[PDB]
Amino acid sequence: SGFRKMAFPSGKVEGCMVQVTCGTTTLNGLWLDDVVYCPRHVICTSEDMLNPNYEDLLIRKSNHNFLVQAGNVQLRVIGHSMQNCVLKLKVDTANPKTPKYKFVRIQPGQTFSVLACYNGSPSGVYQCAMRPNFTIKGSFLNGACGSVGFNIDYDCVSFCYMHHMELPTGVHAGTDLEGNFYGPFVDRQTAQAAGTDTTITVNVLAWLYAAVINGDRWFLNRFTTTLNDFNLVAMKYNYEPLTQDHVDILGPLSAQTGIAVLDMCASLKELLQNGMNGRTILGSALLEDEFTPFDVVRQCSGVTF
Amino acid sequence: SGFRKMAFPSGKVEGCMVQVTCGTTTLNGLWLDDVVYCPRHVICTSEDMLNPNYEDLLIRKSNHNFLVQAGNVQLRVIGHSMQNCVLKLKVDTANPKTPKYKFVRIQPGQTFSVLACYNGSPSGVYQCAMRPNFTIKGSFLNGACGSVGFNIDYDCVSFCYMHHMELPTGVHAGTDLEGNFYGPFVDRQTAQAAGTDTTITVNVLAWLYAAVINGDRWFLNRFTTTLNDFNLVAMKYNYEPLTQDHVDILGPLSAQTGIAVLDMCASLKELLQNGMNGRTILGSALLEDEFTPFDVVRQCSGVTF
Ligand SMILES: *C(=N)[C@H](C[C@@H]1CCNC1=O)NC(=O)[C@@H]1[C@@H]2[C@H](CN1C(=O)[C@@H](NC(=O)C(F)(F)F)C(C)(C)C)C2(C)C
Ligand SMILES: *C(=N)[C@H](C[C@@H]1CCNC1=O)NC(=O)[C@@H]1[C@@H]2[C@H](CN1C(=O)[C@@H](NC(=O)C(F)(F)F)C(C)(C)C)C2(C)C
């Protein structure tokens, strides 16, 4: 029993973290095979960040202007290339700790673990969801850029996020490992706003199934609803519309508990309209939306890596 | 910015997990140097767990009755010993991945990371507090026993917990690495209850300082209080009494924010007496008590390992 926000074990990713310095700017890099990936703004001075021309700035940089350190050991840089918002530094040594890996661009609503680093050294690990507005609710300070987000499927690490910036609301933005931002964000120090932050309905439903499996079931009411009637309610509370694809992904949890997805929708509708009346669900006084159906199954079944 | 429940990077601990089987019972073991530590109930059948005489049961076991596996490789068991509620298996190979480590018995209110394992393989990592009633609010299924709790201080791993059981309220109980239970618990399948679950006042205060540092400061009121007047309020809400030692540990956060601890106590008093009126603090609709002052400083300063 019990249900906690759980991150993947970080060991495979810890062995890939390096420190990248260009001039006076230092941040984290990810060393896989003979390439180090890092945010391209490592080449900026604080002034350049206000309105950078990355192509012009990078032209003043040679391989010897990038200092890459793994622990106390220096890596020799033998090439450099800019791919979208990431810089790729070719080094003369393949990382001996390179895990089996792939680069994935995740969909909004999916979750991943973040290994927060400073100066190439891991500080901690936490779980994040890619929100529908393509921001994450992270915890990052100066020097955190280059910290990565990932998922594990037994022995394969799927890297999906690299940290680049913080928006005025305190939420975070970054790119996939090809350097393409999630969302409309640009790597420039100018006012940018994320857009309306909607709730991931299929994740709230998965978390209510997690609650039932854990014996927390006071909220189960005597009503049912339809997809269109539920969505009329959900859109009023800034919830994402629920589709048959979402009902299908909830299939294993609905089958395990015997509770039809539309019956759970009707319980969610009552919780939205009436609130929780001072009660809690899985130790929370709010409806939690950062657990995917996969996270609930995995945790309630003990999937290992 | 941002404040999340953050676990330590788990790599150093992942390299210590092994699988221990005795008869038909399998659980996790911790391999450090040439010793594997695991819960002594690995020697029980399901029936034995109802009222076990561990001394008599262990006498029917020889070294060859313990199967220890690290990945696909078998470790040779050359000795065994029971120390309190843990079994210590001497193996013929020192773990080549043994980190710098120590065994610590933590105090109630302190936090640690849990690397949840099944069959000697890591499943995930989460942060826990040792509650004042000596239980933890974890997430564990059958086969999780032997999963450990730890903290890291740069390169040294301090192991503080080994998982043994779940209580009727859904909370968890276990021992330090010397096999002594935290709390009054015994490793027997009989009705046991944890006792009143009080709130860790110094941790709630540290989390309110984390909120202020993050710009969430709607709750700061115009009052102050005394330690005795605050404690009269706190004891009514099942909060632990606050002492000058706690005020001293809060010193760095009070100095950073300029907010005196007794002023923060008066804001906490109003939150207890009035509730949050539907508002949130750091994304929570409840007062969070599983962040120590050290966790807040470390996260707000970027301490690395
Ligand atoms: C990389 N190490 C930091 C991480 C930031 C620092 C504070 N918390 C974080 O997540 N990245 C930056 O400092 C990036 C970097 C320039 C400016 N910047 C920002 O995150 C700024 N944000 C914005 O300008 C905004 F609002 F548009 F998103 C900052 C004001 C410092 C938070 C570049 C090149 C984007
Ligand atoms: C070890 N792998 C499991 C972990 C348990 C299983 C469910 N969630 C967990 O944390 N440990 C046990 O099964 C231990 C073990 C016998 C019984 N047991 C329990 O946790 C039981 N609890 C109690 O009897 C109680 F309430 F007193 F704490 C159980 C009913 C299975 C939850 C021994 C030797 C204590």
Author numbering:
A (entry chain A), B (entry chain A): 1 to 305
Text from the published report:
The crystal structures of the Mpro mutants with the greatest reductions in susceptibility to nirmatrelvir were determined in the presence or absence of nirmatrelvir, including S144A, A173V, A173V+T304I, T21I+S144A+T304I, T21I+T304I, and L50F+T304I. Single mutations T304I, T21I, L50F, and T135I had minimum impact on nirmatrelvir Ki values, while the S144A and A173V mutations led to 46- or 16-fold increases in Ki over WT enzyme, respectively. Overall, the cocrystal structure of the Mpro S144A mutant complexed with nirmatrelvir was similar to the WT Mpro/nirmatrelvir complex. It was noted that the hydrogen bond interaction between adduct imine nitrogen and G143 backbone NH could be significantly weaker in the S144A mutant than in WT Mpro because the distance between the imine nitrogen and G143 NH hydrogen is 2.08 Å in the WT Mpro, while the distance in the S144A and T21I+S144A+T304I mutants was 2.80 Å (34). In WT enzyme, the S144 side-chain hydroxyl group forms hydrogen bond interaction with the L141 backbone carbonyl group and stabilizes the loop. Because the S144A mutant lacks this hydrogen bond interaction, the loop comprising L141-S144 could be less structured compared to WT and consequently lead to the weaker hydrogen bond interaction between the adduct imine and G143 NH. This could explain the decreased enthalpic contribution in the S144A mutant enzyme binding as observed by ITC. The ITC experiment showed that the binding potency loss in the A173V mutant compared to WT is due to an entropic effect, while the binding potency loss in the S144A mutation is primarily due to changes in the enthalpic contribution to binding. The A173V and S144A mutant enzymes were also affected, with 5.7- and 3.9-fold reductions in kcat/KM, respectively.
